Amino acid sequence: AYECGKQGGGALCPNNKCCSRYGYCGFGPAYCGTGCQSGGCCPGKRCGDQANGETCPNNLCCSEDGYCGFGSEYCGAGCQGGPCRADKLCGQLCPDNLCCSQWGFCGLGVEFCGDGCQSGACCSMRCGRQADGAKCTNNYCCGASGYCGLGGDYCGAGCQSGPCT
Amino acid sequence: AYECGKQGGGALCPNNKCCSRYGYCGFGPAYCGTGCQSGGCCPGKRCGDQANGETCPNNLCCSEDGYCGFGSEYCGAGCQGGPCRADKLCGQLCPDNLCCSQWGFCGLGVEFCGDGCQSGACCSMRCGRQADGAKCTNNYCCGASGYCGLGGDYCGAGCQSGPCT
Ligand SMILES: CC(=O)N[C@@H]1[C@@H](O)[C@H](O)[C@@H](CO)O[C@@H]1O
Ligand SMILES: CC(=O)N[C@@H]1[C@@H](O)[C@H](O)[C@@H](CO)O[C@@H]1O
Q1: How far apart are CA A62 and CA A7, in angstroms?
Q2: Is the separation of the CB atoms in B19 and B34 below 8 Å?
Q3: Which residues line ligand 2 (CB under 6 A)?
Q4: Does the beta-carbon distance from A32 to B113 stay under 8 Å?
Q5: Whose CA is nearest to atom 15 of ligand 2?
């Protein structure tokens, strides 16, 4: 049974484990080297302006030079994406389903996803019949009971709008 | 089949999708709310000095208050884990399999994991008979051909040292 990557339904490995070209999790050249799909690849996966705007998997930072990693060389000056040290503006959805707060910054946690959340993975956004026909942002599904989200509970039976079924 | 979490062998969802209490990926309260296992949970998972030292899944930042998220509130002042904005010294392992560079900082990518990597997910750290009996760090396995790693390719057939199976 595959664990990760294109063989494993796009799953990631935990704790920065590399997903090999064959869809298994580990560390060392066999996993992190040629063909590495995600995790702490070496070299890092290509990203940003150097790779058609692709983001890094596992919330790695995209360096100025368009490689995925962590540390100041990746997250600091010139960082193109992921958890860059610079605040990330939005209003222009946040990458990778991050919440755009009421104040126009990207993040996760209640301060971003809770009250006033504009877009991304908001805690509770109403939609459909139950909200005057409001549509979900981010091409999320409206669930049968009028909350925005993804996965079967929202896109499955009952789904009111967005990429249902 | 299960996708994530305990039920899915510890896999993470892609793109910060929440892992529900039942082991499926999505967004909205059914996935991100009570019993959320990973991803952009709301509220964030507990972490650090509020979770017996457990780090956030998916490389989220652990805030001062012990919640998982992103943004300055989480990664900035008071951050106690994940990709904090502060540099992280090592020499003392890095958390979450991060590479300890030759300069004694934690990160990922070749500047950390490549030449002079001390520990963590090093690109190509030699071990075993090929390295005159050198041990791997991090309780990694030494593979048949004398590289340090984890996963079947290193801990399986031919494993020289570490927690071979
Ligand atoms: C929830 C939210 O959007 N908070 C932001 C914070 O992340 C950002 O660092 C700050 C910059 O002035 O502005 C707000 O407080
Ligand atoms: C590869 C590496 O270890 N680089 C680190 C850098 O990440 C850190 O920000 C700096 C702090 O003084 O020390 C080194 O330059």
Answers
A1: 24
A2: no
A3: A 71-73; B 87, 101, 103, 105, 107, 111-112
A4: yes
A5: B103
Q: Considering only CB atoms, which chain B residues are within 8 Å of A17?
A: 97, 150-151
Inter-residue contact B95 to B116 (CB < 8 Å): no
Judged by CB atoms closer than 8 Å, whether chains meet at B106 and A151 is answered as no
CA distance A157 to B3: 20
Cβ B101 vs Cβ B110: under 8 Å: no
3-state helix, strand, coil in chain A (%, to 5): 20, 20, 60
Amino acid at A161: S
| Beta carbons of A107 and B73 less than 8 Å apart | yes
**Both tokens of residue B91?**
């020499």
Task: Write the secondary structure of chain A as one string of H (helix), E (strand) and C (coil).
Answer: CCCCECCCCCEECHHHCEECCCCCEEECHHHHCCCCCECCCCCCCECHHHCCCCCCHHHCEECCCCEEEECHHHHCCCCCECCCCCCCECCCCCHHHCEECCCCEEEECHHHHCCCCCECCCCCCECEHHHCCECCCCCCEECCCCEEEECHHHHCCCCCECCCC
C-alpha B13/C-alpha B146 separation (Å) is 32
Please tell me the distance from the alpha carbon of residue B48 to that of residue B68, in angstroms, as a whole number: 9
| DSSP letter, residue A129 | G
- From the list B20, B69, B107, the residue facing A73 with the nearest CB is B107
Identify whether the C-beta of residue A41 lies closer than 8 Å to the C-beta of residue A62.
no
What is the spatial distance between Cα B39 and Cα B46, in angstroms, rounded to a whole number?
A: 12
What distance in Å separates the CA atoms of residue A101 and residue B162, rounded to the nearest whole number? 46
Resolution reached, in Å?
1.8
Collect all residues of chain A within an 8 Å Cβ-Cβ radius of residue B21.
none
What technique solved it?
X-ray
CA of B101, closest atom in ligand 2: 3
Listed in sequence order, the DSSP H helices in chain B are 29-32, 72-75, 110-113, 152-155
A118 lines ligand 1 (CB under 6 A): no
Q: Are B31 and B20 in contact (CB under 8 A)?
A: yes
Distance between CA A17 and CA B138 in Å, rounded?
A: 13
